[PDB]
Design a protein around this ligand. Structure first.
Ligand SMILES: *[C@@H]1O[C@H](CO)[C@@H](O[C@@H]2O[C@H](CO)[C@@H](O[C@@H]3O[C@H](CO[C@H]4O[C@H](CO[C@H]5O[C@H](CO)[C@@H](O)[C@H](O)[C@@H]5O[C@H]5O[C@H](CO)[C@@H](O)[C@H](O)[C@@H]5O)[C@@H](O)[C@H](O[C@H]5O[C@H](CO)[C@@H](O)[C@H](O)[C@@H]5O)[C@@H]4O)[C@@H](O)[C@H](O[C@H]4O[C@H](CO)[C@@H](O)[C@H](O)[C@@H]4O[C@@H]4O[C@H](CO)[C@@H](O)[C@H](O)[C@@H]4O[C@@H]4O[C@H](CO)[C@@H](O)[C@H](O)[C@@H]4O)[C@@H]3O)[C@H](O)[C@H]2NC(C)=O)[C@H](O)[C@H]1NC(C)=O
Ligand SMILES: *[C@@H]1O[C@H](CO)[C@@H](O[C@@H]2O[C@H](CO)[C@@H](O[C@@H]3O[C@H](CO[C@H]4O[C@H](CO)[C@@H](O)[C@H](O[C@H]5O[C@H](CO)[C@@H](O)[C@H](O)[C@@H]5O)[C@@H]4O)[C@@H](O)[C@H](O[C@H]4O[C@H](CO)[C@@H](O)[C@H](O)[C@@H]4O)[C@@H]3O)[C@H](O)[C@H]2NC(C)=O)[C@H](O)[C@H]1NC(C)=O
Ligand SMILES: CCCCCCCC(=O)OC[C@H](COP(=O)(O)O[C@@H]1[C@H](O)[C@H](O)[C@@H](OP(=O)(O)O)[C@H](OP(=O)(O)O)[C@H]1O)OC(=O)CCCCCCC
Ligand SMILES: CCCCCCCC(=O)OC[C@H](COP(=O)(O)O[C@@H]1[C@H](O)[C@H](O)[C@@H](OP(=O)(O)O)[C@H](OP(=O)(O)O)[C@H]1O)OC(=O)CCCCCCC
Ligand SMILES: *[C@@H]1O[C@H](CO)[C@@H](O[C@@H]2O[C@H](CO)[C@@H](O)[C@H](O)[C@H]2NC(C)=O)[C@H](O)[C@H]1NC(C)=O
Ligand SMILES: CCCCCCCCCC
Ligand SMILES: CCCCCCCCCC
Ligand SMILES: [Cl-]
Lengths: 349, 340, 332, 349, 340
């Protein structure tokens, strides 16, 4: 039993965790891979996403070579605080969580040649800038960049453990996305330049496409039904002024409620989205159908409708409005054309 | 006698290496687990998680801690847990968890003469479970707790439920406002990652949603508005202001019923069972209003120029008084039989 | 080996309780700031979030060393071993350094004793906003920092040549505001424990108009235009014009509460409140216009009031818009 | 100066804070009392409540006897971490805070015979299971159970410092309840069973009655006024079809909004509360008024109302509906009777 | 220079006992306190608390820390406060608080040659005040901050305000969007508990709520709706649809106004001053709708059968044109004089 205690004591005896391996002699090379155990929700309001990972790092440290009856020491994560580890931080990382239940969710493994494996379980919240002009038919590439905070590229360089595509792996059942699809990930690396030197940065982009199904049910269908409802008043007789006024006013006010309730999901951006343009055109169609009736009412001479027992000699009775007859065709046709142009504009692109 | 206990405990921790597991370099250490579930609450469909409070006990043997001459089980101050090796147990689907710390850290250490350690923790964990809401609110959910060792593979540690199916207690006393726990299941398997194979214990609960809340909130208001829209069929064709106002408002009221329901649910890209009903009830109120516009158009549009007859508005109204109640009951018959 | 010996020699006899030059001269600290992003502006709480790389440089003669190595590039381990200034942000509502995966701090010591200390910070900084011109308002949100305990006779801060740097503004989380420019100033603030050198950065921000045009101005304008449809409807249609008149007022009531939902409950009249209130007067007057017309024709020139209202109401709303937008976009 | 330093050093010399006082000789008896500085708000939605307490514990430790210039050593809280303290925890607690602003809010006092007094300021958020069948006229007994976490009743027992009723004291001004009245507290002691032995539990039940004032103003009164409003249409002439229809439909729409919005602050329980029953009957009265008019409208022979000039014998005019005349009495009477039964049922529980 | 200072400061801490207060076993140590208020924010009626940022300074003399030969006040690194005795000050009504920690712990220790210690902390505290909202929004609240020693009684410690009335500064520079701080005052007293008598310092503010926000959001919308319900008095009695639609809409509008205000306040059981106005405006618009029903019933219900006349339909309308504006003015006259 004491054989392994003497090995660990010898490893730390004279060890200086203030100094990186190979300091003053070479560049510390850190191998890195990420296992995404879950891809958490994307927050449109905060323009950020959550991701739970096993952040694996590996590097060589000749000070920790040993000879014993084992080739790998699978040690308690208490040991990792006694040795030098990379100071990796996420460049676009917001408040992230290191899991501590029931113990620090870290593992340290030392092989006999000095190679270290150091993985931790993190909940990472990272900024994802979004261009919501195509919402809800938008797509995003949410980045995840990390690298050393303190060591320039002449001291610490990061590389992927395997081929870059295979170095970030997402669990099959880990998708915690509700209104997005994970199309895939792009893995790259580069150099970031600051006022304090040049730093290696490792980049992963997750490609997310919003799923439009929720917004078809809650926004597009009520908008389409409201526009269809507003064109119903074209078929009523021109003498039903209270009836055709309620049609126009109710549908205009309904589109007002829909428009205000539509942006409650989004951050309060200052540009118009694809949903705003659809609602605006739906507002124009609904508003014009009420304006159409006002023009019809302006040319209505008699306040009584046809009594049902008299032939109109084309007392006297008002005729069916030509504006009403033309609106029965023009309004459905123009709204049908708008839908064709709107959906082909955004679904194709 | 108390001096003898102090000396014995000091002897155990002298030369003890907390960095090394029991039987380091030898056979894996077997860890037995028990859970006493204090409560389950905050089962959130919005956040796709549930909160679980439990007494979590681990049961392993450390031969370095065997002591003789004391016919007692030493319960020690929980701060001694920081001087002993404990398993690096973690929960994979854990989103946010903490060990309670009032008045002190809710932690138990109880040594036994042969070296057995009982390690108990009072834990509140918010674990993730993705819910299939396609049949919501007539849905059953399955939410799990995945217990695993982080740094030790199956070569170093083995998990098992101590007591078999009696390892987890207190499930039958759990009261959720919106769910009833149909059953709970204990699973022990191995999970392989790039760093090796790890023992895993899985505790899963099958949750059935109570529908009594949603009858009062969504279904009954929707049914009554749909029935309300049929009142138009008993009003004369020439009362355009009355029938349009009745038809328009019920269509508007259906949206008001839907928006409140929408605000309390996550952004779900598919149609739920509750969505099918609301969209079904919206069609009925929309068609009932479209029925009058057709009736108004026949009398006033096609009148002067000269399945129901489609030329007598009274026939269409009387046809509507039967078909609309009959079809809506037929829709309810098919809907409730498919989701129950 | 040799670096270990140098590090041990520096910390032998070092007392990190004492500021350098404790009884000789004030410690001069040069500060740099790189803005990673200016986060959202929270008008309701009157605060904004900013993510910065905060760099400090001073001289500690106790950290001099002679060797071929010209600078010691170190991680956060030695940050708590040497003396560090107690810099704090005076208008910070809530701030937090970063600790994933390790403390995001940097320490570099040169052979002449110069110390470079850098750390990553996220700060919720207080910013009192004057919303009188809202939503056409402009602000200069400050960010003040100084020493907590060391007065001007012990610690002096000094901006470098490249004081504040801002990166790609397009990645920032300024949804409703555009970053216009920054200024960095220096001043001495007198408190009860002494005089302290306070360094400030002011970030000029202009509110983008597009959201509130879509959210409030267009809906409120359309309801006003909606109320004018009544003027072309026959005066004999009493239920039609009364329902049209009263529902616009009901809608204008709903729009009024929505407009202020994004603001703190300030008790003065913003430019948004003025527009909404005048739009309330227009929809209110249209219903009163028909009530007067109905009373003087049925419940009995005044009879021709509809013809006047067809011109007067659209012209007065156009005139008000001309005055409203000119005054709040180019005037004070 | 040095006199009291030498006393504290002697006490802690050879002191093992891992061992409870009397371990292997007797049972550690802990006297407990609670001073409630504020009974905080009750959360119906989370079925919890907040309480702020001075939690006081007292036990004997023969290892801490001393003789000196003073009979009681009033020490700062950092001495408490040097000695053995009970591992008390709250069985129904959820997320409790031991305040430490500006220092740990704990006091430790050692008397010359070894008696220790150890109090701490705590904010406990505890579970209070609720039965909401009688809501908003319900009453609850919120429990506050605590005891040792690790030590069984053969090692540590708890007792109240004074008479059990007088060992939980609520401050006169300490009430943060908004919609509840604290009617008193019952204090008891017991034994609980677990998988690790038998433990002493000290229990306090806080008896809270909900104050109905808010729900009368916001739910009951608007419901009663809507029902009264829906019956106003019975006094309108049967020829005012658009007018009386608007009465019926609007009141139903208002009742739908009231019914949906009345459970916002409650947990989504599967049963019906007393408020839900009241709204259901109010909905039925409102719904039946529109059904009543539709029946009245079905027997309206003529589309024109009385002209105000022609005598009505007993052109021709419709007569006042007999269904309306009976509704002008039956509907107000049945709603008054329902209110008498409804309020006598729940205000007497 | 620096060698002597380091020698002196090391000498102070050598043999220092942090477990014993200054003058332990002797007279009480007098602790003076100054507060510089940075800001006040989040005055929440929903949560019944306010959030306060301040610089909290404590002044006391510890003769164990007296030093000579150095004509300087030694400002030491704030970590030395962990090695020194400091008062165990706490805030009794403090729900949640923290010491700021960027870039370091916002803490200051300054020694003086005679042994005096200046100990400053930058604290943001959410302190509870229970607000009486019976006059809301015309209410005037009083929120305090109790400052007490936890473990030290008046035999061991004494509190006082350093500078008397000038001990608290920055109150005149506070900008609350909803309130104006009319007055603040400082109180020193003792409080008796079951464990002893403890010194308490109390700082209280008197907050008068501003009314201008509620004029635009609640009062003006209610007045305009109440006035527009009087329009039906000038409409012909024959127009039943017009006057019912005008009457119903205003009653519905009044509810919508009340719901918007209802959702941003706690669930207090009493009637607030804003509720009295909204109930009053509801009664006025309800009676206006009931006025037409009386007018409608007189003409049609009793017409064939065959102070206002009560038999002339047009007389009732003329009467309502005068009484409703007059009574509402009388209601506003009484309501505003009682609350302003
Ligand atoms: C009321 O009570 C509460 C508690 O209930 C109290 O809060 C506590 O306050 C104390 C300080 O008073 C905190 O203690 C210090 O915390 C420092 C960092 O705090 C930040 O990080 C916290 C988490 O840290 C984890 O992660 C970092 C790296 O990311 C790691 O360094 C830590 O050790 C720790 O890692 C553990 O946990 C993780 C999981 O989280 C595991 O993965 C890991 O394995 C390990 O178990 C974080 O919690 C803090 O947030 C709090 O505070 C912020 C405000 O600051 C607030 O906004 C949050 O809401 C939250 O409240 C915060 O972000 C830490 O650096 C200190 O450690 C120093 O010092 C101790 C002294 O004993 C020493 O033991 C350590 O080894 C270490 O030594 C330093 O480290 C320096 C690092 O830069 C270094 O420069 C020095 O050289 C030296 O380095 C070492 O030195 C030793 C000795 O020579 C040598 O052997 C080594 O080799 C090496 O050289 C210290 O822990 C405590 O964390 C707070 N707890 C909580 C829960 O908040 C509050 O203050 C009280 N109020 C009042 C008024 O009394
Ligand atoms: C919620 O949803 C989760 C996820 O679906 C459910 O979890 C699953 O529960 C079922 C039922 O309990 C599990 O199946 C059982 O698994 C155990 C354990 O298997 C492990 O250990 C075995 C040794 O004891 C070992 O032989 C297994 O290895 C074999 O199987 C794996 C399967 O992938 C295969 O890869 C290997 O090559 C081996 O062939 C494994 O390591 C097992 O003992 C059970 O066997 C019973 O049933 C089988 C028939 O299915 C029968 O042949 C046996 O005789 C015995 O009767 C059974 O397979 C499943 O593993 C769980 N999956 C996960 C991911 O947790 C959960 O149940 C749901 N909750 C509720 C309440 O429903
Ligand atoms: C957005 C709406 C814009 C509307 C613009 C409307 C522009 C405009 O000024 O239209 C006037 C006219 C109204 O026609 P409409 O049928 O509605 O009105 C009839 C018309 O005025 C006849 O001239 C009248 O007969 P008379 O000989 O007087 O006795 C007849 O009275 P009577 O039969 O009851 O006795 C009226 O009912 O409309 C068009 O010609 C359609 C043009 C294309 C309209 C295209 C609309 C999309
Ligand atoms: C929800 C209630 C449902 C009730 C369903 C009731 C269904 C039912 O059978 O109604 C018939 C009748 C309608 O009464 P109502 O007065 O509305 O109808 C009159 C009735 O039909 C007369 O017979 C007609 O005279 P005539 O002889 O033709 O010349 C008269 O014509 P006119 O004078 O106008 O020209 C009609 O107006 O109602 C009752 O008797 C009250 C029953 C108890 C009602 C109890 C109500 C609580
Ligand atoms: C920030 O402060 C620096 C000084 O620390 C300002 O730079 C100075 O600009 C004046 C312009 O007249 C020069 O004369 C000085 O030589 C500059 N000082 C330097 C370069 O150290 C800088 O303008 C400030 N930034 C602002 C106000 O936005
Ligand atoms: C602004 C509302 C306009 C309504 C139609 C007017 C038509 C006038 C034709 C002369
Ligand atoms: C009290 C407001 C009345 C508005 C309509 C007045 C119509 C008649 C004017 C003489
Ligand atoms: Cl309460």
């Amino acid at each position: 039993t004491t054989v392994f205690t003497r090995i660990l004591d010898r490893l730390l005896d004279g060890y200086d965790n203030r100094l990186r391996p190979g300091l003053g002699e070479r560049v510390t090379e850190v191998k890195t891979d990420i296992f995404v155990t879950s891809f958490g929700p994307v927050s449109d309001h905060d323009m950020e996403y959550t991701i739970d990972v096993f952040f694996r790092q590996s590097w060589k440290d000749e000070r920790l070579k040993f000879k014993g009856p084992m080739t790998v020491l699978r040690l308690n994560n208490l040991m990792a605080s006694k040795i030098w580890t990379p100071d990796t931080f996420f460049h676009n990382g917001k408040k992230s969580v290191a899991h501590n239940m029931t113990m620090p969710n870290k593992l340290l493994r030392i092989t006999e040649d000095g190679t270290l494996l150091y993985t931790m379980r993190l909940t990472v919240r990272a900024e994802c800038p979004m261009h919501l002009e195509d919402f809800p038919m938008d797509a995003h590439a949410c980045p995840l960049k990390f690298g050393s905070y303190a060591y320039t590229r002449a001291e610490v360089v990061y590389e992927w453990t395997r081929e870059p595509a295979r170095s970030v792996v997402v669990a099959e059942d880990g998708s915690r996305l509700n209104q997005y699809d994970l199309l895939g990930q792009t893995v790259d690396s580069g150099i970031v330049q600051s006022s304090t030197g040049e730093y290696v940065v490792m980049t992963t982009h997750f490609h997310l496409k919003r799923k439009i199904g929720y917004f078809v049910i809650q926004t597009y269908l009520p908008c389409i039904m409201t526009v269809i409802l507003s064109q119903v008043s074209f078929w009523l007789n021109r003498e039903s002024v209270p009836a055709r006024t309620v049609f126009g006013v109710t549908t205009v006010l309904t589109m007002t409620t829909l428009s205000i309730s539509a942006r409650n999901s989004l951050p309060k951006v200052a540009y118009a989205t694809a949903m705003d343009w659809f609602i605006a055109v739906c507002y124009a169609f609904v508003f014009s159908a009420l304006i159409e009736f006002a023009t019809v009412n302006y040319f209505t001479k008699r306040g009584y409708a046809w009594d049902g027992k008299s032939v109109v000699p084309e007392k006297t009775f008002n005729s069916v409005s030509k504006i009403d007859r033309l609106s029965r065709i023009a309004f459905p046709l123009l709204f049908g054309i708008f839908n064709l142009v709107y959906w082909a504009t955004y679904l194709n692109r | 006698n108390m001096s003898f206990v102090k000396e014995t405990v000091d002897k155990l921790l002298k030369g003890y290496d907390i960095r090394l597991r029991p039987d380091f370099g030898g056979p894996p250490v077997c860890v037995g687990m028990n859970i006493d579930i204090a409560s389950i609450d905050m089962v959130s469909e919005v956040n796709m998680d549930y909160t679980l409070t439990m007494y979590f006990q681990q049961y392993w043997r450390d031969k370095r801690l065997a002591y003789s001459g004391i016919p007692l089980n030493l319960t020690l101050d929980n701060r001694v847990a920081d001087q002993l090796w404990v398993p690096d147990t973690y929960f994979l689907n854990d989103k946010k968890s903490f060990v309670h710390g009032v008045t002190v850290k809710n932690r138990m250490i109880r040594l036994h003469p042969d070296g057995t350690v009982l390690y108990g923790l009072r834990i509140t964990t918010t674990a993730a479970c993705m819910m299939d809401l396609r049949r919501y609110p007539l849905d059953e959910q399955n939410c799990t707790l995945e217990i695993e060792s982080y740094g030790y593979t199956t070569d170093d540690i083995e998990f098992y439920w101590r007591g078999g199916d009696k390892a987890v207690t207190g499930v039958e006393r759990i009261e959720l406002p919106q769910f009833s726990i149909v059953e709970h299941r204990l699973v022990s398997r191995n999970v392989v990652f790039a760093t090796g194979a790890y023992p895993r214990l899985s505790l899963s609960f099958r949750l059935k949603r109570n529908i009594g809340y949603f009858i009062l909130q969504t279904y009954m208001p929707s049914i009554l508005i749909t029935i309300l829209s049929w009142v138009s069929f008993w009003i004369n064709y020439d009362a355009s202001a009355a029938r349009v106002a009745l038809g328009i408002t019920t269509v508007l009221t259906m949206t008001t019923i839907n928006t409140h329901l929408r605000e309390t649910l996550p952004k779900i890209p598919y149609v739920k069972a509750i969505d099918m009903y609301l969209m079904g009830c919206f069609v009925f109120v929309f068609l009932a209003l479209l029925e009058y516009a057709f009736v108004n158009y026949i009398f006033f549009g096609r009148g002067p120029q000269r399945i129901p007859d489609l030329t007598d508005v009274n026939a269409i109204d009387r046809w509507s008084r039967i078909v609309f109640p009959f079809t809506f009951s037929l829709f309810n018959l098919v809907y409730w039989l498919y989701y129950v | 080996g040799d670096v270990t010996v140098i590090l041990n020699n520096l910390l032998e006899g070092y007392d990190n309780k004492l500021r350098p030059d404790i009884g000789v001269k004030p410690t001069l600290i040069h500060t740099d700031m790189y803005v990673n992003s200016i986060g959202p502006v929270n008008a309701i709480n009157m605060e904004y979030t900013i993510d910065i790389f905060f760099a400090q440089t001073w001289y500690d003669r106790r950290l001099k060393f002679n060797s071929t190595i010209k600078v010691l590039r170190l991680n956060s381990n030695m940050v708590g071993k040497i003396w560090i200034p107690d810099t704090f942000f005076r208008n910070s509502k809530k701030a937090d350094a970063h600790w994933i995966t390790t403390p995001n701090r940097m320490l570099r010591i040169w052979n002449d004793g110069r110390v470079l200390y850098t750390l990553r910070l996220t700060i919720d900084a207080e910013c009192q906003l004057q919303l009188h011109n809202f939503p056409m308002d402009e602000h200069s949100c400050p960010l003040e920092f100084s020493s907590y305990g060391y007065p001007r006779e012990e610690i002096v801060y000094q901006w470098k040549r490249s004081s504040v740097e801002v990166g790609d503004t397009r990645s920032w989380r300024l949804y409703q505001f555009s970053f216009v420019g920054l200024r960095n100033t220096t001043e001495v603030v007198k408190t009860t424990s002494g005089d302290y050198v306070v360094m400030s950065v002011y970030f000029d921000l202009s509110r983008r108009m597009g959201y509130f045009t879509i959210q409030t101005y267009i809906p409120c304008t359309l309801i006003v235009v909606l109320s004018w449809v009544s003027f072309w409807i026959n005066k004999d249609a009493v239920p039609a014009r009364t329902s049209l008149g009263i529902t616009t007022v009901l809608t204008m009531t709903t729009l009024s509460t929505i407009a202020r939902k994004s603001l703190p409950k300030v008790s003065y009249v913003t430019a948004m409140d003025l527009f909404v209130s005048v739009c309330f007067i227009f929809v209110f007057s249209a219903l009163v216009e028909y009530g007067t017309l109905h009373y003087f024709v049925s419940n009995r020139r005044i009879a021709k009031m509809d013809s006047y209202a067809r011109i007067f109401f659209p012209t007065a709303f156009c005139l008000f818009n001309l005055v409203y937008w000119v005054s709040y976009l180019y005037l004070g």
